[PDB]
């Protein structure tokens with residue numbers, strides 16, 4: 001149940017709530033108050049999904065889908081069977097995600113490490129919350145949120161995007177995508193660089209961080225450095241999500257039409273708007 | 282259908298990849314152990330991989346993993362419960378004993394070397410011709426602990442030469458001796474360096490280095506461990 | 522408050538680092554570029570040096586030729602008016618030959634021929650760049666992980682512009698060179714193939730792209746969290762595990778019940794990222810060659 005080096009780390013303390021009440025492990029897993037909170041929120045949500053599945057009349061995981069209230073409910077409560085289940089499950093999900101983060105905080109405290117991980121995870125939570133809370137509230141109905149189903153969540157992405165033409169034309173979406181793609185590029189490069197130094201040509205000595213700098217300077221003329229690359233990975237992945245959130249929060253609140261039309265502001269700048277030729281004249 | 286065969290083949294590949302990846306990740310820390318150090322009965326479904334050998338540069342030897350595992354240090358902790366899964370309490374001063382968040386690992390008692398075989402980390406005075414290039418120069422600043430008392434003064438920066446970065450501050454105490462403070466654990470301000478992890482009385486307790494012009498991996502671990510340990514173990518006098 | 526190690530507090534600088542020698546031909550290496558204090562807040566301040574050599578010259582020349590072939594076509598489309606050039610920049614497009622020309626290299630210059638020429642230049646640019654990722658590692662005695670990972674990206678690129686059009690029997694299937702038009706092409710590709718959301722390989726591709734962001738956020742945050750114990754010195758933590766690596770490991774073990782090593786996390790990383798374009802390429806390759814309509818295929822499971 002313990003890694004060879006683990007024992008010296010398994011000390012009391014670090015908890016945020018309840019002192020030593022929940023200060024223990026189950027196998028590898030640390031508990032803590034928020035470990036218990038996670039369990040409660042998660043088990044509740046799952047029971048409610050199963051209830052919704054019964055009301056839907058299916059146990060097929062590829063068919064089960066829990067929908068938000070119809071638009072006519074606005075931001076009000078709804079019958080369990082007509083959106084209420086979705087609403088309570090959303091609360092459970094939020095409670096579970098936030099509890100997971102807070103449990104991570106407890107783990108950081110015990111290990112005496114920085115809080116970077118739960119801080120990063122909070123970006124993911126905030127993106128989820130953009131889609132099920134901030135946006136629907138700003139738009140004035142829970143029904144603008146996505147449904148909880150494997151395929152139906154994708155229908156919602158497809159229907160929501162196409163409400164505005166090709167959703168590619170959303171400028172914040174473009175930046176988000178760039179961050180996602182660049183992040184994967186940098187993840188591949190980071191993994192490869194470290195590995196190529198730790199596993200050199202057959203029979204050679206391990207290369208050093210100096211060789212990692214040299215390879216990359218040789219290749220592209222720059223090396224961000226070992227601290228830099230981990231900051232970058234974090235920045236890229238968090239920016240990707242930040243701009244994801246941004247791109248959705250502006251959609252249906254301050255921008256309403258086909259996203260393609262937004263770009264016309266540049267085209268119609270008065271100094272060139274009326275010149276004949278090109279694509280737009 | 283070829284797309285069917287493709288997707289079925291991929292899932293088989295993927296399970297194989299995950300198996301490979303998980304076993305690659307068991308080269309340290311396994312086999313799993315009961316809380317008394319004996320091999321655990323349940324080792325999980327993944328077996329240890331075949332050993333690999335790293336050839337270390339600069340005649341430093343080799344590393345073979347997986348291999349026989351031991352802490353190579355005493356651990357001043359004791360069970361708080363008969364059943365598994367509960368904390369082990371410090372039997373002494375956890376900070377002085379290097380346990381919990383003050384833990385350190387029995388790393389090599391030699392300094393990390395760069396690609397050319399020179400010490401990676403040097404005090405700036407011995408690093409030609411390194412200098413502060415931007416931000417507040419902390420040399421000369423008083424160092425304040427979390428009790429808001431002065432514990433010393435910055436007399437140098439220890440730099441990572443190959444990476445051109447500040448790694449430690451060398452801090453002189455009242456008695457004229459110095460300690461390394463990890464750069465990640467200090468706040469450089471305009472009139473002081475503030476150290477949140479340690480109260481003024483805890484600086485003398487920071488592990489010391491054998492030679493004044495180099496730091497070994499073991500020393501770094503003891504120092505970094507001790508300083509990080511203060512966030513949990515000095516929390517009494519802070520209050521700030 | 523506590524320092525977070527996102528930005529450095531104090532920069533230090535020394536003599537320019539000219540780097541390791543090994544089997545590198547030092548004559549093909551440039552001098553150092555300038556130092557950027559601005560970059561230095563976040564990563565290394567030093568720019569250069571860079572390795573030139575014959576392959577690199579070829580790659581750079583080729584790449585520039587690709588870029589200028591497109592640009593000259595844009596200028597043409599703009600009627601050589603610079604204001605129109607700037608106005609309509611993202612709307613210009615160098616398009617492949619029409620389907621009636623098939624795979625033929627006799628497509629007229631202004632109807633696909635220039636696209637073929639641009640594509641030839643990009644082909645050599647990228648493949649010579651790949652050789653360079655291999656050779657730069659080789660001259661340093663390093664593993665070839667970069668060249669192998671780069672091959673996964675090249676796979677999708679090859680499928681999009683080369684392999685799929687050849688199997689489909691016309692260049693008209695390839696992607697045009699244009700900012701907006703490459704987007705229109707992407708949208709249209711899904712529409713015509715019955716919605717790529719029903720392509721299980723597109724789903725996998727997305728799992729790994731999202732996963733890459735998940736995993737890099739995890740790894741990045743982890744290393745920064747243990748940088749107070751020198752955790753970013755990953756190679757030395759591999760050679761001689763420290764408390765950084767141990768605390769990193771245990772954070773994850775206690776959180777989610779399993780963990781990596783300092784070396785192995787970088788294997789999770791490289792695979793997570795390369796699987797993006799590997800599955801992606803497969804998904805695109807089967808589209809139209811084997812599966813006309815992904816919705817339909819899904820209804821059959823095969």
Ligand code: BCL
Pocket residue numbers: 097124125126127128130131156157158160161162166167168173176177180240241243244245247248707
């Ligand atoms: C036809 C469809 C439209 C379109 C529709 C829209 C719509 C609509 C949306 C996007 C959004 C996304 N689109 Mg788009 N977009 C399309 C074209 C694309 C293309 C492409 C190559 O063509 C790409 C790359 C993208 C990519 C982008 C991303 C920027 C973004 C999704 C990531 C995200 O929000 O993360 C955020 C991360 C999360 C939400 C996950 C958080 C989950 C956390 C908190 C916890 C859950 C864990 C728990 C349940 C697990 C159980 C425990 C188990 C034990 C594991 N789109 C086309 C044009 N796009 C979305 C977006 O920006 O969202 C904000 C969005 O709503």
Ligand code: BCL
Pocket residue numbers: 046049128131146150151153154157718723724725727728729731732735
């Ligand atoms: C992010 C922007 C859009 C989005 C658009 C897309 C698109 C487009 C696709 C997916 C796909 C996925 N989405 Mg989605 N989806 C979003 C909302 C989310 C949320 C959430 C916010 O809580 C969740 C849990 C999921 C999860 C799912 C997975 C079923 C699938 C692969 C994800 C993945 O590997 O991620 C990366 C993370 C990991 C690798 C970690 C593993 C975690 C996964 C495996 C957990 C899945 C849990 C799921 C079965 C629910 C379990 C809940 C239980 C009741 C406890 N999506 C929003 C609305 N999503 C793909 C798919 O194939 O769907 C069929 C796909 O093509």
Ligand code: BCL
Pocket residue numbers: 157181184643647674675677678681706707708709710711716717718722723726727728730797798800801802804805
């Ligand atoms: C309306 C749009 C369609 C769409 C149809 C498309 C199509 C078409 C494709 C994708 C593809 C993908 N889609 Mg989709 N997709 C849909 C909506 C989604 C959504 C969503 C709804 O949120 C998401 C998240 C995704 C996301 C994804 C990615 C997982 C995947 C691309 C991975 C990649 O790294 O490519 C980026 C990486 C590359 C293209 C490789 C680059 C290669 C190198 C060699 C290039 C060198 C460049 C160099 C010459 C220039 C240098 C200049 C510099 C100055 C140096 N899609 C909808 C249904 N999608 C791709 C895929 O694989 O699908 C299976 C694809 O072909």
Ligand SMILES: CC[C@H]1c2cc3[nH]c4c(c3C)C(=O)[C@H](C(=O)OC)c4c3nc(cc4[nH]c(cc(n2)[C@@H]1C)c(C(C)=O)c4C)[C@@H](C)[C@@H]3CCC(=O)OC/C=C(\C)CCC[C@H](C)CCC[C@H](C)CCCC(C)C
Pocket residue numbers: 038041042043044045046089092093096097100104117118120121123124147148149150153237238241731732734735738739742776777
């Ligand atoms: C911000 C950068 C990226 C990121 C970061 C990130 N994610 C993280 C973390 C961080 C650093 C971790 O600390 C944490 C983790 O422990 O990972 C191993 C995590 C995590 N990200 C996860 C998933 C995830 N992250 C996502 C992506 C991202 N995470 C971003 C791209 C996605 C996408 C892109 O779809 C998914 C699916 C988990 C593996 C883990 C969070 C685990 C957790 O919160 O557990 C507690 C809750 C449960 C055990 C289950 C709750 C059940 C609910 C009550 C019911 C289900 C409701 C749900 C809304 C239904 C959805 C149905 C779908 C079909 C739509």
Ligand SMILES: CC[C@H]1c2cc3[nH]c4c(c3C)C(=O)[C@H](C(=O)OC)c4c3nc(cc4[nH]c(cc(n2)[C@@H]1C)c(C(C)=O)c4C)[C@@H](C)[C@@H]3CCC(=O)OC/C=C(\C)CCC[C@H](C)CCC[C@H](C)CCCC(C)C
Pocket residue numbers: 181182184185188189192219220580581584585588646647648650651654667668670671672673674794795796797798
């Ligand atoms: C695993 C999949 C992910 C991935 C992996 C990946 N990409 C990679 C690598 C790998 C590991 C390489 O090693 C290789 C690399 O060297 O990266 C630094 C690369 C690479 N991926 C790149 C981009 C890229 N990758 C893509 C993404 C991805 N790459 C996937 C997400 C994409 C996307 C998402 O659309 C892009 C655009 C390049 C930076 C690089 C390939 C370099 C190359 O083939 O260059 C050929 C062209 C030239 C040599 C010059 C081009 C000319 C320019 C268009 C304009 C002129 C500017 C010029 C550079 C200045 C010169 C002027 C002087 C004379 C003054």
Ligand SMILES: COC(C)(C)C/C=C/C(C)=C/C=C/C(C)=C/C=C/C(C)=C/C=C\C=C(C)\C=C\C=C(/C)CC/C=C(\C)CCC=C(C)C
Pocket residue numbers: 588589591592593595637640641643644678679680681682683696697698699700703
């Ligand atoms: C200021 O003006 C100047 C002229 C000075 C500079 C301006 C330049 C400008 C504005 C250029 C802008 C370039 C743009 C917008 C490029 C955009 C490119 C994009 C978006 C590419 C997207 C996808 C590209 C793909 C998938 C290409 C694939 C290519 C291949 C796989 C090559 C296949 C090879 C072929 C067809 C040739 C076959 C021949 C042999 C011998 C094998």
Ligand SMILES: COC1=C(OC)C(=O)C(C/C=C(/C)CCC=C(C)C)=C(C)C1=O
Pocket residue numbers: 185186187189190193212213216222223224225226229568
């Ligand atoms: C393998 O790790 C990597 C580094 O090397 C150790 C890098 O350096 C970079 C490149 C970083 C940047 C910010 C390029 C911009 C540089 C200038 C001149 C403005 C990437 C992507 C990388 O993944």
Ligand SMILES: CCCCCCCCCCCC[N+](C)(C)[O-]
Pocket residue numbers: 049061062064065066148149150
């Ligand atoms: C709200 C969605 C319903 C939750 C479904 C439970 C997750 C099961 C995993 C889906 C994959 C189905 N499977 C394993 C049979 O292939």
Ligand SMILES: CCCCCCCCCCCC[N+](C)(C)[O-]
Pocket residue numbers: 299303324325326327778779780
């Ligand atoms: C997303 C990839 C799936 C990762 C989950 C499978 C790996 C967890 C299994 C590790 C078991 C831990 N153990 C028993 C070896 O200590």
Ligand SMILES: CCCCCCCCCCCC[N+](C)(C)[O-]
Pocket residue numbers: 220221222551552553554555568569570571
């Ligand atoms: C993908 C990373 C791209 C980094 C940008 C390239 C920077 C070129 C620096 C080389 C300059 C050296 N110099 C001045 C001697 O030519």
Ligand SMILES: CCCCCCCCCCCC[N+](C)(C)[O-]
Pocket residue numbers: 720721722723724725728729732792793
């Ligand atoms: C490197 C390990 C990462 C494992 C991620 C696996 C996630 C599975 C996503 C389900 C995709 C389902 N489908 C139908 C699109 O294939």
Ligand SMILES: CCCCCCCCCCCC[N+](C)(C)[O-]
Pocket residue numbers: 027028325777778779
């Ligand atoms: C693709 C999602 C899969 C979710 C399964 C959860 C993986 C965690 C495995 C941890 C191993 C637990 N163990 C063996 C130590 O008991």
Ligand SMILES: [Fe+3]
Pocket residue numbers: 190194230740744755787
């Ligand atoms: Fe790393």
